[PDB]
Amino acid sequence: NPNTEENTIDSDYLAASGTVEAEKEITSIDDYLGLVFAIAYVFGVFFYV
């Protein structure tokens, strides 16, 4: 159930909040999305990721 399991709720809405930022017109989200994941493990040390 994607509407009662908060684990998929958090990930689905979080992923949708990121792919929608393609409207900011940075570049192909299909390209730099992999860099976002790597960049998170640089600054995510602050949050213990």
Contacts to another protein by CB under 8 A: 1-4, 6, 9-10, 13-14
> If we measure between CA atoms, which residue out of 14, 38, 35 comes closest to residue 26?
35
Nearer to another protein, 3 or 28 (CB): 3
Crossing angle between the packed helical segments 29-43 and 6-19, to the nearest 10 degrees:
120
Nearer to another protein, 15 or 36 (CB): 15
Phi, psi of 30 (to 5 degrees): -65, -20
Closest separation between CB of residue 12 and another protein, Å?
9
Closest separation between CB of residue 9 and another protein, Å?
5
